[PDB]
Design a protein around this ligand. Structure first.
Ligand SMILES: Nc1ncnc2c1ncn2[C@@H]1O[C@H](COP(=O)(O)OP(=O)(O)OP(=O)(O)O)[C@@H](O)[C@H]1O
Ligand SMILES: Nc1ncnc2c1ncn2[C@@H]1O[C@H](COP(=O)(O)OP(=O)(O)O)[C@@H](O)[C@H]1O
Ligand SMILES: Nc1ncnc2c1ncn2[C@@H]1O[C@H](COP(=O)(O)OP(=O)(O)O)[C@@H](O)[C@H]1O
Ligand SMILES: Nc1ncnc2c1ncn2[C@@H]1O[C@H](COP(=O)(O)OP(=O)(O)O)[C@@H](O)[C@H]1O
Ligand SMILES: [Mg+2]
Ligand SMILES: [Mg+2]
Lengths: 145, 194, 145, 948, 48, 145, 48
């Protein structure tokens, strides 16, 4: 159950989804939770006093922001997503993201094309680390492109 | 046109961005008129809360019209994040409309907008127009930006526009007139007092 | 609204009785006016100005109570979603007299500014834009049907 | 620059030329909230309510009364910022649409024009500027000659009364015509006046408006002179003399009335250099000291400042004004300005006498009643709306809605005390200022309840303000200043202060004839001390270091109150009371010790210098304490007798009201005396600033119980809202005004959960009355209880106006507010502007933290039960002394107490070190010290018993 | 970079009990060396 | 303690220690956020039972008279003003405020009204815990002995 | 006997005509307004 945070009905949906999933064991995901730090505080307090199902999981997607309460940061485990360190890591991530079935399609050339694409992608984002020289500004060349 | 049609084919939205007066809203309206679509322009602001946007989307999906939301970034960041869910639901409804196995003899495609099932016409589309150069404007969350294909609309071709407008209005010397008026506007911009 | 519709009586009963009372008072006053149509003779009718003010207040109060009915009517015809509450009430009430609807089409259509009708105002021959351009339907639409 | 007149003229000309009726809707976009301008969508009901612009446009579109056949011009007369104007982006674009959040789309009719009349576009974005046709009106477009011609034409054509008076106006205009020419007297004076420096930015139209109003008053004066002399109507020669002299006088008082005395003198010298009008022949006296007699001759103002002898029972009274040169000049100027119903501004340092001067000039106008408003940083047009609701009434006339005072034949004057405090938006706009300007210029405003234009009638505005360079003061809009002339009220000079307070001290000391010979030195000493204080403690150090003639008035009033019951008193007693009042007024607000020591020494030196041949020790023994607890007169009290009396009273207090034991020490006695001084004064509110846990609340409750005041505290919880605070305010006001119950309303800064709380408190402290607190059924119940009360004390009062006035008087007399906060710096600076009354109507007491002496006394008294007796104690060679007044051969007990004080101070230093290292610190309070000594006593007793 | 003590204790428990490098190792000192190395490695991985 | 303690224990061991210490005296656990906090607090005041209140960073000012011990002894009664009502204080009442966030900053009044008890993690304690854990995991017989 | 008169009127009609008057009447009108609005029945004039 994926929910975008930012509205009161969104908060109600998040509360209901968590309440049903802690019993049923499904996964709950809340995006952009950095936009309501107080509600994050009460959410962490509610999470502390729970004995949920074994398979229950809660994902909180946030952008790196000081307004995030440190109580929630200590309560949970943090994973940082950012540009891959280098060309090799970028290409590895790109190849991991694409399913093997998609790349291995009946036109045998397709894979090579994908490889080329990956390389090109892994180039341009890398040039973003050199802001004045690689480009003229920090374009948002991301996974959607 | 190329970028917007590419976005439409993938059932995504369009996001032309650039400074004011570059022809973004007018370009979107012109593209909608080229395809014979009913295009509605909305001057968004902070009072466009979640239920208002949901009602607008319900109306657009039922009628099958185009929604050109100009100054999209004037909404609150939390509110943009909230609207992203409705945008994603609408795009998924359009995508399952685009599938081959389904035919118009089956049940109509519906999406869950405002806790109700609403039919989605295939002609409906969503376009957002913004200029990220203003200070104080909200920043679109990434989960919402990935739902739109963006395009920089920064420098309109003033010379060609002037030439064609003067030619179509009956000016016999339209070429020289445009070639004199466009540089004159440039000189007026960067020669007079600021 | 309350005479050309059936479900409104079952769904808004309080509004139905109150509007019936208001209509009774309005018809009584208008009959008194019709007996002697002299503007002065109307003027010196005792307690008429405050009666009209009360009538206006009550009618305005009733208008604010038709939100759900208007929402359902919008659900009936999608383009009504781009029509305000008072304009939608005017359209639905004056559906019999289509002459007053010509000013409301610009809100519902891209280029349609008025419809073309025969002398009986019973059959829709075609449409017209704001600049006078006209489109004639190949098969006309019958309002009576 | 002639913009408004230009578009009005164009509208009228188009209407006459084309036969199309022109209708213009003037809207001030920034005078109302954007929700009130464009509309609201109810989050619960989802029902759309139109704003002002939306309602106007929708009414034009509907064309029920044929608005589509007219030429409609919607003029946005106000500041433009990208918050409200961007919602017009579709309106100003080729879409020509207004798109509302509810999905409604309004098409702009072809006959509607959207116009903006603005003075600048320094905040408007490019998307907004590019969408509109620009017309730039330079200031040179409207020449000064144009304004002069308009003024003269109106003077010759329009009667000022509502014809002999028209003849007066025409004759005056004929006399004034030579001076109202290019390069003439007025233009030269104007171009020179821009070279001078003023308390506010000078504009041509403000000066011209002040001059025109004063000239109209001159014509009215001529009319009155003719009326009072029917046998001989005033002739041409005397008329010419009078008009020329009055014109030069009005030029002087307009073009330099908002500047220092030096700039007025410079303008007078320049005018005398350039003009040809006859002038006073004094060698060095500047022209500004001469008024213009109705006979047509220069007359010194000094003739109208007689040396008066105030009544002995009315010394330092609020309504008593000692005439002074500046006093009479400013009073005449204010009378002239108010008589024309022209709004005005009193600018000057706080306590200079702006409010006093305005009220004194208001005495000469009996048809005119004043209502006080105290603007704050959170002040919005809602305050003005509440005041209009209370004192005015909306009546419907065939021309529209008219808002007028309920009391017929009288002019209501809204004296707003803090014009320049309201928070300026980040686009350089004060909402209440724009709203006031909308009333002043257009004679009305918009009711947002139904978006209806309401015209003011018989309503006048007077503003007060400190100079805009002061902290928390914002410069007023230029477009607002063009309607309101500004007059600078500066602090009285040493000579004027000497005169006024010598008169007061004479009328005071006439009670004791033996002291009558000491009036001249006493006053001088006062002034001298005050002078040094004003130049020693500036606002640059602390926000509350503001000394004004209010301090001198309080000094005189306190000395009079002390000397009132006494039958005889030596010079030593008078000196002691003088020093005591000086300490209570100048040393209570001091923050750290060096300033208090400086004040003590300087009072010593001033008393010695201005009062020689007196016993220094008899009149100035350092523990100066006065009380009326051990007697019936406010006489000096011994420290030990006071300590025993307070101990007995506290023993009663513990059993009766609050069972919390207290440790007595000298600062507690001083503090309870200070609180008792204020609980005995009318409208006496306290502001206690000190560390939490220092006993401010407990001492306040103890003193209130001593004085019989009922202690009231609001019970704040998590879900406390503004409505709960309003309910508590209504309860306390009902108890304090309808039942004649003296109440001590004690409140802490922690109780303030919203700026609305501070706004309500500001209004209540300043006026003793919240305008919008009682309304509806609460108001009716309030009048009921007020009537029962008024008939209970035998007052025959039935109508609502005087019942409410009596209720306000009862609240003023019976309610005392105690405010407690911690001694923060940024917080104090913020509150200095957020609630100005907290520093103007509240007596400030800086309790601070417990001093080292206070800690030592507390420890010594508390550990008296503990043994701490070691006869063979060996004093170390280097005793680490902490209490500097500790005996040098200390006992074991004294060493123990010194160690305890050192422990407290080393915790202070440890927290200082953690704060410096970037760590997190928790404040150390005297409650920590009390816990430490309590644990010490308990552990000592336990361990001794166990060992034994 | 806000980490609780429970996070470090979970790291320690994983190194002690859920360590894949202690399949058949039975020597106490060898197990201790493996535990130390895996503690450093797992702490770095989880924190990083 | 002389003033009622405020406990700062991120690990939560201090709360367990307090509950076990006062278990025989019927200690109950509540929170400032709980809607039953008021009734539980007045019950503890009236019956003199130990009370443990968590989430002190959401402090309710209603406890201000209780923390300051502003008791009034009239007519043989010891009264405490809990909001707007007088309650017969029991001499055996005791309260413990707790929090799990060491980074919270309290206003000076609350810091004055309570005595702080910080349950920080020391190097010696951590070494002891880790040594016991490794002994139990790798040398179960030795740890059990 | 006034108690019985008031009780008789209240029992027979459900309302005592002279019980609410003055400020009590205005307060009753306000509470009646808010209670009718809460129920879902909109009324503004005193008689209804
Ligand atoms: N053509 C004119 N002839 C004579 N007097 C004029 C003329 N135009 C304006 N005035 C006068 O000069 C003054 C200018 O006022 P006006 O309302 O025109 O200013 P504005 O440009 O709109 O200024 P603001 O932005 O401060 O409102 C007024 O006293 C007005 O009566
Ligand atoms: N390709 C074009 N041909 C003709 N006119 C154009 C073109 N592009 C822009 N314009 C004109 O420029 C003006 C401003 O464009 P607009 O839609 O306001 O852009 P933006 O969305 O950046 O504000 C419009 O009036 C439009 O008619
Ligand atoms: N000429 C004077 N005669 C009598 N009192 C004066 C005179 N000048 C100043 N004062 C004293 O100065 C004080 C002025 O305070 P106020 O008018 O409230 O200042 P402001 O208007 O700046 O707030 C009064 O209390 C008054 O006693
Ligand atoms: N002089 C004193 N002797 C003993 N205790 C004191 C003294 N002053 C304050 N206290 C303690 O302070 C507590 C009340 O503090 P309070 O006055 O509410 O702090 P604040 O001054 O910040 O309002 C009481 O419980 C009392 O024990
Ligand atoms: Mg645009
Ligand atoms: Mg103007």
């Amino acid at each position: 159950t994926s929910i975008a945070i930012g509205s009161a009905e969104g908060f109600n949906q998040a509360d209901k989804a968590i309440n049903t999933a802690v019993k049923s064991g499904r996964w709950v995901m809340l995006k952009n939770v950095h936009l309501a730090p107080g509600w994050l505080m009460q959410l962490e307090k509610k999470l502390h006093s729970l004995q949920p199902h074994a398979c229950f999981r809660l994902f909180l997607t946030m952008e790196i922001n000081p307004k995030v309460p440190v109580n929630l940061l200590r309560a949970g485990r943090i994973f940082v997503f950012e540009p891959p360190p280098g060309v090799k890591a970028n290409m590895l991530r790109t190849f991991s993201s694409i399913p093997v079935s998609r790349i291995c399609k009946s036109p045998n050339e397709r894979a090579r094309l994908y490889f080329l694409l990956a390389w090109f992608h892994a180039i341009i984002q890398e040039r973003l680390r050199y802001a004045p020289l690689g480009w003229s500004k920090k374009y948002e060349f991301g996974e959607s492109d | 046109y190329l970028t917007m049609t590419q976005a439409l084919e993938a059932r995504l939205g369009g996001s032309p961005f650039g400074p004011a007066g570059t022809g973004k809203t007018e370009s979107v309206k012109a593209l909608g008129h080229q395809l014979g679509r009913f295009v509605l322009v909305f001057n968004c602001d902070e009072t466009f809360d979640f239920q208002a946007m949901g009602r607008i989307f319900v109306g657009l999906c039922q009628v099958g019209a185009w929604g050109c939301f100009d100054e999209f970034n004037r909404l609150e960041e939390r509110m943009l994040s909230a609207v992203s869910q409705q945008v994603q639901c609408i795009q998924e409804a359009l995508r399952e409309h685009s599938n081959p196995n389904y035919d118009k003899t089956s049940a109509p495609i519906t999406c869950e907008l405002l806790n109700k099932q609403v039919k989605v016409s295939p002609d409906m589309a969503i376009f957002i127009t913004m200029n990220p150069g203003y200070a104080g404007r909200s920043n679109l969350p990434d989960n919402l930006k990935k739902l739109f294909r963006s395009l920089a609309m920064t420098k309109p071709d003033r010379q060609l526009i002037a030439q064609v407008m003067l030619y179509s209005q009956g000016f016999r010397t339209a070429e020289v007139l445009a070639n004199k008026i466009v540089p004159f506007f440039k000189l007026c911009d960067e020669q007079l007092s600021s | 609204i309350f005479t050309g519709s059936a479900d409104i009586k079952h769904l808004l009963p309080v509004e139905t009785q109150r509007f019936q009372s208001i209509s009774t008072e309005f018809l009584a006053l208008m009959k008194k006016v019709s007996k002697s149509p002299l503007v002065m003779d109307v003027l010196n009718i005792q307690g008429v100005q405050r009666s009209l003010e009360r009538l206006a207040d009550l009618l305005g109060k009733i208008q604010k109570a038709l939100g759900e009915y208007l929402e359902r009517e919008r659900s009936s015809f999608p383009r009504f979603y781009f029509v305000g509450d008072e304009d939608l009430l005017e359209i639905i009430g004056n559906s019999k007299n289509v002459a007053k609807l010509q000013k409301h089409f610009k809100k519902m259509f891209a280029g349609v500014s008025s419809i073309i009708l025969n002398e009986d105002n019973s059959v829709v021959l075609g449409i017209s834009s704001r600049e006078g351009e006209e489109v004639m339907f190949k098969t006309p639409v019958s309002i009576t049907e | 620059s002639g913009k408004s007149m230009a578009w009005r003229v164009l509208l009228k000309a188009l209407e006459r030329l084309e036969g199309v009726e022109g209708v213009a809707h003037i809207i001030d976009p920034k005078a109302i909230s954007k929700d009130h301008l464009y509309g609201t969508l109810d989050p619960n009901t989802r029902e759309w309510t139109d704003g002002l612009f939306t309602h106007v446009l929708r009414k034009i579109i509907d064309s029920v009364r044929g608005e589509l056949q007219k030429r409609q011009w919607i003029v946005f007369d106000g500041d433009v910022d990208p918050e409200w104007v961007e919602n017009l982006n579709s309106v100003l674009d080729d879409n020509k649409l207004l798109t509302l959040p509810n999905g409604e789309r309004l098409s702009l009719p072809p006959n509607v024009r959207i116009m903006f009349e603005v003075q600048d576009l320094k905040y408007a974005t490019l998307a907004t500027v590019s969408r509109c046709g620009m017309v730039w009106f330079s200031e040179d477009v409207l020449s000064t000659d144009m304004i002069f011609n308009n003024f003269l034409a109106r003077l010759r054509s329009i009667p000022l009364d509502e014809s002999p008076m028209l003849q007066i106006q025409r004759d005056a205009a004929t006399i004034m015509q030579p001076y109202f020419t290019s390069n003439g007297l007025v233009t030269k004076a104007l171009e020179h006046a821009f070279q001078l420096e003023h308390i506010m930015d000078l504009t041509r139209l403000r000066c011209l408006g002040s001059l025109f109003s004063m000239l109209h008053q001159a014509c009215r004066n001529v009319a009155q002179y003719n009326a009072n002399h029917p046998d001989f109507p005033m002739q041409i020669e005397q008329l010419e003399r009078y008009i020329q002299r009055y014109l030069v006088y009005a030029i002087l008082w307009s073009l330099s009335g908002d500047s220092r005395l030096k700039m007025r003198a410079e303008l007078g010298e320049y005018i005398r250099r350039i003009t040809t009008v006859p002038l006073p022949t004094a060698p060095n006296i500047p022209i500004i000291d001469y008024e213009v007699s109705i006979s047509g001759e220069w007359s010194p103002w000094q003739a109208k400042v007689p040396q008066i002898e105030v009544e002995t029972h009315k010394v330092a009274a609020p309504d008593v004004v000692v005439p002074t040169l500046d006093t009479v000049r400013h009073e005449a100027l204010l009378y002239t300005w108010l008589a024309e119903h022209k709004p005005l501004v009193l600018c000057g340092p706080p306590g200079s006498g702006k409010t006093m001067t305005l009220f004194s000039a208001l005495r000469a106008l009996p048809d005119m009643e004043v209502v006080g408003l105290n603007f704050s940083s959170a002040t919005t047009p809602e305050l003005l709306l509440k005041t209009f609701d209370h004192y005015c009434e909306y009546r419907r006339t065939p021309n529209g809605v008219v808002l007028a005072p309920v009391q017929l034949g009288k002019w209501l004057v809204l004296f707003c005390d803090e014009i320049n405090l309201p928070d300026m938006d980040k686009y350089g706009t004060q909402r209440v200022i724009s709203f006031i300007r909308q009333m002043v210029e257009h004679g009305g405003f918009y009711r947002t309840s139904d978006q209806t234009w309401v015209k003011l009638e018989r309503i006048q505005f007077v503003g007060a303000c400190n100079p805009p360079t002061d902290p928390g003061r914002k410069p007023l809009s230029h477009r607002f200043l063009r309607h309101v002339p500004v007059v600078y009220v500066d602090y009285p000079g040493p000579a004027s202060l000497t005169q006024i307070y010598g008169t007061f001290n004479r009328a005071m000391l006439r009670l004791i004839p033996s002291l009558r010979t000491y009036a001249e030195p006493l006053t001088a000493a006062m002034v001298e001390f005050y002078t040094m204080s004003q130049e020693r403690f500036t606002q640059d150090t602390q926000p509350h270091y503001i000394y004004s003639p209010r301090e001198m008035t309080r000094w005189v009033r306190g000395i009079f109150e002390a000397l009132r019951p006494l039958e005889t008193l030596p010079v030593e007693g008078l000196i002691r009371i003088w020093a005591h009042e000086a300490l209570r007024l100048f040393q209570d607000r001091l923050v750290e010790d060096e300033e208090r020591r400086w004040t003590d020494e300087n009072i010593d030196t001033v008393a010695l210098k201005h009062f020689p041949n007196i016993d220094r020790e008899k009149a100035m023994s350092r523990p100066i304490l006065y009380s009326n607890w051990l007697s019936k007169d406010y006489i000096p009290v011994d420290q030990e007798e006071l300590r025993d009396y307070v101990k007995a009273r506290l023993k009663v207090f513990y059993e009766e009201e609050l069972d919390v034991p207290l440790v007595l020490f000298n600062e507690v006695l001083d503090h309870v005396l200070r609180i008792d001084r204020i609980f005995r004064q009318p409208q006496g509110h306290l502001l206690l600033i000190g560390v939490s846990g220092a006993g401010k609340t407990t001492l306040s409750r103890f003193v209130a119980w001593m004085n019989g005041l009922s202690v009231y505290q609001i019970k704040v919880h998590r879900k406390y809202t503004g409505e709960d605070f309003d309910e508590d305010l209504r309860t306390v006001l009902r108890r304090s005004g309808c039942k004649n119950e003296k109440i001590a309303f004690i409140m802490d800064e922690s109780n303030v959960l919203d700026s609305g709380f501070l706004e309500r408190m500001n209004t209540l402290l300043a006026n003793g009355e919240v305008p919008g607190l009682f309304e509806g059924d609460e108001y009716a119940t309030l009048m009921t209880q007020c009537k029962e009360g008024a008939q209970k004390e035998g007052l025959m009062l039935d109508s609502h106006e005087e019942l409410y006035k009596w209720f306000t008087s009862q609240v003023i007399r019976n309610l005392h507010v105690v405010f407690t906060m911690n001694p923060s710096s940024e917080g104090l600076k913020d509150r200095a502007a957020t609630s100005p009354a907290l520093f103007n109507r509240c007596v400030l007491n800086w309790f601070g933290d417990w001093s080292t002496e206070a800690l030592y006394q507390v420890g010594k008294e508390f550990t008296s039960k503990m043994d701490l007796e070691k006869p063979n104690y060996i004093v170390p060679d280097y005793m680490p002394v902490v209490y500097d007044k500790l005996p040098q051969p200390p006992s074991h007990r004294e060493a123990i107490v010194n160690s305890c004080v050192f422990v407290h101070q080393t915790l202070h230093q440890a927290n200082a070190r953690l704060a410096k290292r970037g760590g997190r610190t928790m404040a150390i309070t005297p409650r920590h010290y009390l816990d430490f000594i309590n644990h010490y006593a308990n552990l000592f007793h336990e361990k001794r018993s166990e060992l034994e | 970079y806000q980490y609780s003590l429970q996070f470090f204790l979970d790291i320690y428990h994983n190194v002690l009990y859920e360590n894949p490098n202690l399949k058949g190792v039975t020597d106490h000192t060898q197990r201790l060396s493996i535990i130390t190395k895996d503690l450093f490695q797992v702490a770095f991985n989880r924190v990083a | 303690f002389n003033r009622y303690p405020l406990i700062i224990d991120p690990s939560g061991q201090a709360t367990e220690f307090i509950m076990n210490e006062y278990k025989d005296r019927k200690i109950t656990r509540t929170s400032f956020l709980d809607d039953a906090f008021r009734k539980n607090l007045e019950s503890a005041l009236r019956f003199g039972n130990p009370l443990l209140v968590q989430d002190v960073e959401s402090y309710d000012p209603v406890l201000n008279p209780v923390l300051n011990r502003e008791v009034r002894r009239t007519g043989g009664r010891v009264l405490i003003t809990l909001g707007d009502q007088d309650i017969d204080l029991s001499p055996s009442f005791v309260i413990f405020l707790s929090t799990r966030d060491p980074t919270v900053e309290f206003p000076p009044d609350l810091c004055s009204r309570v005595t702080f008890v910080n349950f920080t993690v020391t190097r010696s304690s951590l070494q002891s815990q880790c040594l016991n854990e490794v002994l139990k995991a790798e040398r179960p017989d030795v740890d059990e002995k």
